[PDB]
């Protein structure tokens, strides 16, 4: 029984580890049309049929919000945004003093003061000549110089550049792929808690596509909940944590920017093309969005049913609009058609719930200069886009916050919040965990090596 | 009894493939002095003893216009040129409005209107002080504002230039095989651009190839081994450039007889700028010499070669250039650190039928340059002092064949094809990059010994 | 019976060679703060057991002034410095002329004119607006154009100033040879710069060396184990630098007795610039203090060690600097994130023959040219409050006056303005060789016939 150990290699070992993600796309499908920020100039093509493999007799743990692909990919999109915006020109000259007027031509009376026609004293490409140039601007992007003279709102902030318009902002599915010697653990449980083991497990060499959707209050174009609307958070007792909600069935939303924009080109300097919005054709109409009602009641009621599992299920559940603050979390944002929108979802949360016509329209705002992400060290000017913008998108989830001070386990309340993009990226990447294969191993046996 | 397969490793495979060429230089002989764009002051040096290996009993196929080291090196050159320009300072402030006048006195009568003297409102290195400076400008570089003139490119991308000490002289380069990869060459003295080559050889690492930039004439090219070779993707198609390669060199002399001087200019804090100072002595147009009889006999050999694909009674006509962008209208080269544009219509005013000693061409200088076909970049030629003189070998031609020519008679040609991809093909046509797959299998009599 | 050569593997081999050295820092201790100029965002943490073993029966050839790791040091430090300088703001706007005045605020009579109140019509956040802003400047950073002053470095490379969050305090950096290479060190405490070292040891990684920047005397360096040592690859060549390494430290204080106040103005969008604010209280000179008796006892020990290389009763004298660029003219070093310059002439005013504290005035410069480079220039951010500095003197760099006759009356002077010899002072103990585990030898076997 004097056993000896013996070396085994290629044996199945996991080790919790973090490494850099591998960019991937299905056969580089973005090559069909140029040019896209999120797909960049190039990325590695991948097989259209990754071999998903069901690990039977297997249980393993996924500690959500401890996973590092989210932060790594957060840095990746920050870097990609910076690299896409590096080559294109700067816009420091714009905020010389502005002489502005008071748009009343072909305007709807509910919007008076949203747009300003301003003129200024920037120069031409010639170093010793100036030109009088005028353009319209949304009121959200400008402020009065004194208590009128106007200036661009973000000049006493960091520098401002133009998004050069040749490259689109549309999201494209991004595939994350394991480096050699790694695999991507994936859960199969249909109701899987954000934390805790998953009863049935599968792994893939390489993951499916996820759109880098940028949104602030509503989850858009996300994967649908597999069986039922479901809610996750790090700890429901701690109200400082954002409340994740995933919809079981999608809710379609229509959004258009109904007016004809016109665009004009201005020379700032040699090789410096600039774009500004020209006169608008037709009566000016506020951009807005459309959503169904009975379905909104239906999704919210299902949300209440699932919320009642974490509370005494006779408790009152109520929604209300955001508590205020910066508009980036006070208002819902999305980028359809390559343009920035801020929509007043306050009407979506005007309801109450207790124990036991067909559409909704929402006003939307427009801004051109953006403080992207949570950075304050850059500001960027999106191009004017001619024509009528139109977006159709799927509503797939919610991000919520719960008010504190609740007593006696009654009257639980919620508001939209937690606008950090990390939470959307968790909501999308929650199925995966990078892991290390350690093929070498040892074990006892009855084998004794042959004598030399 | 029945045969079994066996594993053979190291067996020589040829697989058509592409990888990135490894830079190389001839022992870094230039590294003693600075600085060279085409050498980056250094590449990996190579031994003087690569050994070409003959492949007896071996034939293999080549395909020009389909090989890829050409465009690989094309983007290599674009990258190197941009890298060299990047550290240098921009010249954006220069196109402030200029008051100008014509150059007068001490001039050749054939110079009238070529040079212009302009002044600036342009400021000092101190942002609060101004100065008035002047420089001598070529006519071709400047355009009227509506006398007043402006630099022509300040309604396209901006112009940058510094680092004048860096030389533009070309260097031998070896695109030298990465490990596991080889370079093979056709040994046939006369070979089509495509098709198998009856005798082939391999090298571990390539011959010296020059990065020279030329528009209408092939310069410093390798000589054709026996006869003036004519190559193209398809002779019948007139959209394909016709390659002409000499088997004998044709010397060409060129110079700038003007004694030039330079003035250093400070525009910003620590950013030196150079302007062309007043020329010493009489002005004389830059010109180039080639030998008359050599040109005639060479073109006679060329038309004899042209007769091979055509009817023997076809009249070979050569014609004045077609026009268009100046860089395809006129022959251009950079030798001596400065760019030129010369009238080659004199060289191609002749016709050929079945059965004193030199030639001089007027030539042009442009100091504002758009390299390749790019629009987003532009640079300024630094003034070079004194008289420059260059001697070089004319080694080939890049021609286009006109359309029409009905009833198979009176074929005509004109210079064209400004793409340097074709030049670099004309040199690199000998080589092909192939993949060595050392592993293999084969039947044998081995059945594995038990235990 | 005849012998045949065998092949061995793993036999330790050494070839005098060079590779790029590893980055190594102690347990990544800098990561707790964001961030040191040299340590930056990340580096490899040190091994918890930097094991070294003395080599039995090995003497090894060492060659100071020939090791190329010191050039790697110079290049890598320049690279790190420019890496940290790069994501910062240019100050080309500052070349505008400044109206200046000879302001004082209860100033001492020995600094009158060392500070100037300069104002200029400046830049606003808005291109079409201008505003007048003033700040206090040292006279040695500015120059009369033909009073109106212009800052001294506008007829040279451009000036950049930003990124105050980075730290200029040296951090020990350990270096490890690449795998397949090894580090060799001399165990002889009395070892020359060159020659065989009788007692040797090898280590996975070198010890910590702080990237100290000094021009006349060494700081923060390792102490000599037993006695003061003097090194130079050829003492007969006076143009070469003379190394001096102390075995006992020499404490030195340096301070700028006043608080400093800071103001910040915007060149434009994202163009934060820090300027020296008005300074309150009595305005006094930055200065350094060193003990007298110690400064003898170390100098006398240096003379005693010095007499080894010359004939007995040779007269030894020190004098004040012969002049040149201010960097070699005065002793320069950075502490508290700020650059200093001091007139070290006082402490060389002595002579030596056979058989309580010193106070030194100091000067401040803000526009600084790194090393001997002219292609870059920067402005030093103001450092708030009174800077207080406690530091150790561990060695000096000297030059020998040429000429004389009969090998007597030797006179020495500070010099060697190259910091190459500053890092040599620490790196001299180390070499890296190449290991090829392969070997051959004769033997009595034959491969079994199959």
């Amino acid at each position: 029984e004097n056993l000896w150990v013996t070396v085994y290699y290629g044996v199945p070992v996991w080790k919790d580890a973090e490494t850099t993600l591998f960019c991937a796309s299905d056969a580089k499908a973005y090559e069909t049309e140029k040019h896209n920020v999120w797909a960049t100039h190039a990325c590695v093509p991948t097989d259209p049929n990754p071999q998903e493999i069901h690990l039977e007799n297997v249980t393993e743990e996924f500690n959500m919000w401890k996973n590092n692909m989210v932060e790594q990919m957060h840095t990746d999109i920050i870097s990609l945004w910076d690299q896409s915006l590096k080559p294109c020109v700067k816009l420091t000259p714009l905020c010389v003093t502005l002489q502005c007027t008071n748009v009343t031509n072909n305007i709807t009376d509910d919007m008076r003061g949203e747009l300003k026609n301003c003129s200024f004293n920037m120069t031409t490409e010639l170093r010793d000549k100036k030109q009088k140039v005028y353009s319209l601007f949304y009121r959200l992007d400008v402020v009065q110089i004194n208590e009128k003279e106007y200036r661009l709102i973000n000049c006493n902030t960091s520098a401002i550049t133009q998004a050069c318009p040749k490259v689109s902002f549309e999201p494209i599915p991004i595939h994350y792929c394991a480096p050699a010697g790694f695999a991507i653990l994936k859960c199969k449980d249909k109701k899987f808690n954000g934390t805790g083991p998953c009863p049935s497990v599968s792994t893939v060499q390489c993951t499916h596509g996820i759109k880098p959707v940028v949104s602030t209050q509503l989850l858009l174009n996300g994967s649908l909940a597999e069986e039922e609307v479901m809610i996750r958070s790090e700890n429901i007792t701690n109200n400082a944590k954002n409340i994740l909600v995933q919809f079981n069935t999608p809710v379609q939303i229509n959004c258009t920017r109904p007016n004809n924009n016109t665009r004009k080109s201005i020379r700032i300097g040699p090789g410096q093309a600039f774009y500004a919005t020209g006169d608008i054709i037709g009566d000016i109409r506020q951009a807005h969005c459309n959503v169904s009602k009975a379905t909104w009641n239906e999704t919210l009621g299902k949300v209440v049913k699932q919320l009642r599992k974490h509370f005494g299920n006779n408790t009152i559940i109520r929604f209300a609009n955001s508590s205020g603050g910066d508009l980036e979390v006070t208002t819902h944002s999305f980028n359809c058609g390559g343009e920035f929108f801020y929509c007043n979802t306050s009407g979506l949360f005007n309801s109450t719930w207790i124990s036991n016509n067909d559409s909704i329209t929402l006003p939307c705002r427009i801004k051109q200069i953006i403080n992207m992400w949570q950075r304050i060290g850059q500001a960027m000017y999106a191009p004017p886009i001619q024509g009528v913008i139109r977006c159709v998108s799927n509503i797939t989830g919610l991000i919520l916050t719960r008010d504190g001070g609740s007593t006696n386990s009654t009257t639980e309340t919620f508001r939209p919040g937690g606008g950090d993009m990390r939470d959307n990226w968790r909501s999308e990447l929650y199925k995966y965990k990078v892991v290390k294969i350690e093929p070498l191993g040892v074990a006892p046996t009855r084998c004794k090596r042959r004598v030399v | 009894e029945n045969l079994w397969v066996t594993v053979y490793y190291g067996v020589p495979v040829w697989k058509d493939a592409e990888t990135t060429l490894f830079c190389a230089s001839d022992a870094k002989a230039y590294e003693t002095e600075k600085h060279n764009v085409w050498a980056t002051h250094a590449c990996v040096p190579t031994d003087p003893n690569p050994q070409e290996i003959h492949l007896e009993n071996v034939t293999e196929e080549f395909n020009m216009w389909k090989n890829n080291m050409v465009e690989q090196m094309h983007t290599d050159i674009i990258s190197l040129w941009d890298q060299s320009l990047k550290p240098c300072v921009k010249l954006t402030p220069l196109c402030v409005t200029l008051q100008c006048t014509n150059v007068t006195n001490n001039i050749t009568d054939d110079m009238r209107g070529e040079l212009k003297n302009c002044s600036f409102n342009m400021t000092t290195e101190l942002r609060d002080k101004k100065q008035k400076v002047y420089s001598l400008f070529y006519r071709l570089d400047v355009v009227q504002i509506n006398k007043e003139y402006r630099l022509i490119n300040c309604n396209t991308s901006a112009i940058t230039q510094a680092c004048p000490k860096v030389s533009f002289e070309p260097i031998p380069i070896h695109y030298c095989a990465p490990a596991g990869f080889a370079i093979l060459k056709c040994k046939d003295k006369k070979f089509n651009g495509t098709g198998p080559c009856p005798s082939v050889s391999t090298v571990q690492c390539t011959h010296g190839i020059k990065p020279v930039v030329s528009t209408q004439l092939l310069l410093n090219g390798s000589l054709a081994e026996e006869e003036v070779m004519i190559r193209s993707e398809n002779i019948t198609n007139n959209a394909k450039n016709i390659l002409v390669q000499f088997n004998t060199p044709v010397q060409i002399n060129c110079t700038r007889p003007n004694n030039n001087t330079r003035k250093s200019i400070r525009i910003g804090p620590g950013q030196a700028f150079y302007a062309t100072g007043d020329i010493i002595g009489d002005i004389r147009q830059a010109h180039c010499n080639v030998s008359k009889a050599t040109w005639n006999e060479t073109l006679g050999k060329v038309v004899k070669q042209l007769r091979k694909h055509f009817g023997n009674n076809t009249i070979i006509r050569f014609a004045n250039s077609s026009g268009g962008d100046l860089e395809v209208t006129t022959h251009s080269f950079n030798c001596g650190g400065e760019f030129f544009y010369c009238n080659t219509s004199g060289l191609f005013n002749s016709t050929w039928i079945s059965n004193n000693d030199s030639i001089t061409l007027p030539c042009r200088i442009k100091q504002i340059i758009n390299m390749w076909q790019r629009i987003g970049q532009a640079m300024y030629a630094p003034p070079i002092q004194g008289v420059i003189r260059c001697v070089s070998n004319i080694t080939g031609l890049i021609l286009t064949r006109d359309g029409g020519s009905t009833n198979s008679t009176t074929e005509t040609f004109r210079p064209g094809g400004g793409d340097m991809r074709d030049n670099w093909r004309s040199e690199l046509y000998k080589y092909k990059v192939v993949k060595i797959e050392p592993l293999g299998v084969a039947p044998t009599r081995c059945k594995r010994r038990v235990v | 019976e005849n012998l045949w050569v065998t092949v061995y593997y793993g036999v330790p081999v050494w070839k005098d060679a060079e590779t790029t050295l590893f980055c190594a820092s102690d347990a990544k201790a800098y990561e707790t703060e964001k961030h040191n100029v040299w340590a930056t965002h990340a580096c490899v943490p040190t091994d918890p057991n930097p094991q070294e073993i003395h080599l039995e029966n090995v003497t090894e050839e060492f060659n100071m002034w020939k090791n190329n790791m010191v050039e790697q040091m110079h290049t890598d430090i320049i690279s790190l410095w420019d890496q940290s300088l790069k994501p910062c703001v240019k100050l080309t706007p500052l070349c505008v002329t400044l109206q200046c005045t000879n302001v004082t605020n209860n100033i001492t009579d020995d600094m009158r004119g060392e500070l100037k109140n300069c104002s200029f019509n400046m830049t606003t956040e808005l291109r079409d607006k201008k505003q007048k802003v003033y700040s206090l400047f040292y006279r040695l950073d500015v120059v009369q154009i033909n009073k109106e002053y212009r800052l001294i470095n506008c007829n040279t490379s451009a000036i950049t100033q930003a990124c105050p969050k980075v730290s200029f305090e040296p951090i020990p950096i350990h270096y490890c040879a690449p795998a397949g290479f090894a580090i060799l060190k001399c165990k002889d405490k009395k070892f020359n710069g060159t020659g065989p070292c009788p007692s040797v040891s090898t280590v996975q990684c070198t010890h910590g060396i702080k990237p100290v920047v000094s021009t006349q005397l060494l700081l923060n360096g390792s102490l000599a184990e037993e006695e003061v040592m003097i090194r130079s690859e050829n003492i007969t060549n006076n143009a070469k630098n003379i190394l001096v390494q102390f075995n006992t430290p020499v404490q030195i204080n340096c301070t700028r007795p006043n608080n400093n106040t800071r103001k910040s103005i915007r060149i434009g969008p994202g163009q934060a610039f820090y300027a020296t604010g008005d300074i309150i209280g009595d305005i006094r000179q930055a200065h350094c203090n060193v003990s007298k008796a110690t400064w003898n006892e170390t100098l006398g020990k240096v003379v005693k060690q010095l007499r080894k290389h010359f004939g007995n009763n040779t007269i030894i004298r020190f004098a004040n600097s012969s002049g040149g660029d201010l960097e070699v003219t005065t002793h320069s070093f950075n502490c508290g994130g700020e650059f200093f310059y001091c007139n070290t002439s006082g402490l060389f005013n002595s002579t030596w023959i056979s058989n309580d504290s010193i106070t030194l005035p100091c000067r401040i410069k803000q526009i600084i040219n790194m090393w001997q480079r002219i292609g870059q220039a920067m402005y030093a951010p103001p450092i708030q409050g009174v800077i207080r500095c406690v530091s150790n003197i561990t060695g000096l760099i000297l030059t020998r006056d040429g000429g004389s006759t009969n090998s007597t009356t030797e006179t020495f002077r500070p010099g060697g303005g190259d910091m190459r010899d500053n890092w040599r002072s620490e790196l001299y103990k180390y070499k890296v060789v190449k290991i090829e585990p392969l070997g051959v030898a004769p033997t009595r076997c034959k491969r079994r016939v199959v």
């Epitope: 010793d128 | 409102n121 400021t123 942002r127 609060d128 | 706007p93 201008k130």
Partner: nanobody, 140 residues
């Protein structure tokens, strides 16, 4: 109408200096350009000098270089003028009057990373309401 006050009539010896004072109600010098003009009986008007309303520019006729200096009190509530070297032919009527000018960029140069280099100039628009004037004469 902004009230204007001038110095009274004065007789001065040959080869000696003379000074005058000037006032305007409401401290209107900050908004109107200060000006001076001399005229003798039967002769045309002669411009002597000016201050800008900002008080940042001064100027003189080339005939009066080295003989005339212009000063004002703190807050520019009054302006003063000093004449030097008067002779018998300097006898004339000396006047105050406010003025208005045009300030325009005469040359300029946009700077991407710095202030726009600018050359500015003052262009007087018209001569505003005159003062009652001052009479000075030279005799033994």
């Amino acid at each position: 109408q902004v009230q204007l006050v001038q110095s009274g009539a004065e007789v001065k010896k040959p080869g000696s200096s003379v000074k005058v004072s000037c006032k305007a109600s409401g401290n209107s010098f900050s908004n109107h350009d200060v000006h001076w003009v001399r005229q003798a009986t039967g002769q045309g008007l002669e411009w002597m000098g000016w201050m800008s309303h900002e008080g940042d520019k001064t100027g003189l006729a080339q005939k009066f270089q080295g003989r005339v200096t212009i000063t004002r009190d703190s807050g520019a509530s009054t302006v003063y003028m000093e004449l030097r070297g008067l002779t018998a032919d300097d006898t004339a009527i000396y006047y105050c009057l406010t003025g208005s000018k045009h300030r325009l960029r005469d040359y300029f140069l946009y700077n991407e990373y710095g202030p726009n280099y600018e050359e500015w100039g003052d262009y007087l628009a018209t001569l505003d309401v005159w003062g009652h004037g001052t009479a000075v004469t030279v005799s033994s």
